[PDB]
């Protein structure tokens, strides 16, 4: 018997995205809400998300990426001449873009079963992860210096992030003085350690400009 996604379940999803926006806590929700849903049902939820067109652009292309990938590892038989039982699900089919609700349900209840509903879901999750990333605050603790990156370039980036940080003036001090040195590559770090704990920024740059 077919039971489509309940309007209540679909409505809760709206309020979730409405409140939680795109914090990392949304994903767990999405999973709980989308448990056992068909590729069609998932799409309903996705299309139910108003606004946030930016994040959506990502989700979309991400879907397309995974779908295209699927076709490579599963080229089954393009053009099933002479009928048999049931055609194999292509990427676009899993995504539900080119598959009827019946076909989807069919693939899920066949021997062996092809859980297209779950497969598509996984792809959506990956897309959601990417979205959360671009929405997550820039942590200065991850700004390291590349082994070939000019010291000046590193400084520009380091300070840029600093300008966009929520921390007390005291903590910022530690970052400017100590941290900047800590994340420098082995060579520059070796030169900075020669100047001592109190060298000025200008001095450091002049020392590592080679």
């Amino acid at each position, epitope marked *: 018997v077919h039971q489509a996604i309940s309007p209540r379940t679909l409505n809760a999803w709206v309020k979730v995205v409405e409140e939680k926006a795109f914090s990392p806590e949304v994903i767990p929700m999405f999973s709980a809400l989308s448990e056992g849903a068909t590729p069609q049902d998932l799409n309903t939820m996705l299309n139910t998300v108003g606004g946030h067109q930016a994040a959506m652009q990502m989700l979309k292309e991400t879907i397309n990426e995974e779908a295209a990938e699927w076709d490579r590892v599963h080229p089954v038989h393009a053009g099933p001449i002479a009928p048999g039982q049931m055609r194999e699900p292509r990427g676009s089919d899993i995504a539900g873009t080119t598959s009827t609700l019946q076909e989807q349900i069919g693939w899920m209840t066949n021997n062996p079963p092809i859980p297209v509903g779950e497969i598509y879901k996984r792809w959506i999750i990956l897309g959601l992860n990417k979205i959360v990333r671009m929405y997550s605050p820039t942590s200065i603790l991850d700004i390291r210096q590349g082994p070939k990156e000019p010291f000046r370039d590193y400084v520009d980036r380091f300070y840029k992030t600093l300008r966009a940080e929520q921390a007390s003036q005291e903590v910022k*001090n530690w970052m*400017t*003085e100590t941290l900047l040195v800590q994340n420098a590559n082995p060579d520059c770090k070796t*030169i900075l*350690k*020669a*100047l*001592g*704990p*109190a*060298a*000025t920024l*200008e*001095e450091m740059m*002049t*020392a590592c400009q080679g």
Partner: antibody
Amino acid sequence: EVQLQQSGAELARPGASVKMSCKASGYTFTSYTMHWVKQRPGQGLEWIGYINPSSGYSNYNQKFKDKATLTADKSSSTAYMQLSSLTSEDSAVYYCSRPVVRLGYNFDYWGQGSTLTVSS
Amino acid sequence: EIVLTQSPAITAASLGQKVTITCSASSSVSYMHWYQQKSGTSPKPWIYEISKLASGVPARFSGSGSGTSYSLTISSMEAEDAAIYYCQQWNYPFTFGSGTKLEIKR
């Protein structure tokens, strides 16, 4: 013309304190660090420590901890070195030097010196 | 930690003689600096990064060495070269050497 004009000679009671000065000129005070050196006859040249004009951070030589205290005044481009709990052992000439950064620190600029005499 | 011991402690050279003073560090150091000081005056930067001469320093001067042993040499000693020479750790904590008093042999 980068110049460092140090304060005059000092005379203070044993156990007291004193604060020397060094007025910098001809360069951006906050862009460089300021170091201090002690000179006693028979043990010439000992590094005391240095101050970062802008951040106000001071790093001292373990030996002179709880003895020396560096400060800087951006507005008057002057660095102050304060000595406390004086003994005849501290009577000496105190210099200040601003380095030039090349492959590392190069102490190219030194002050004329200030002779401190610990006596009552 | 690092201690710079210079030797000889005091020596007198005759005008024209080739002089060579050394500096021994307790542990390896990348570079070494050299300063010249005369009675009643601020020490003057003489040699940077082991062998680079400072401004106004006579060509007769030269430096060399690596790791734990460094040296300063005067090809032809001259009157104006009499003074005290100190060596210095190129990096923090910028420790100074014990010094060497160079005099004139008459």
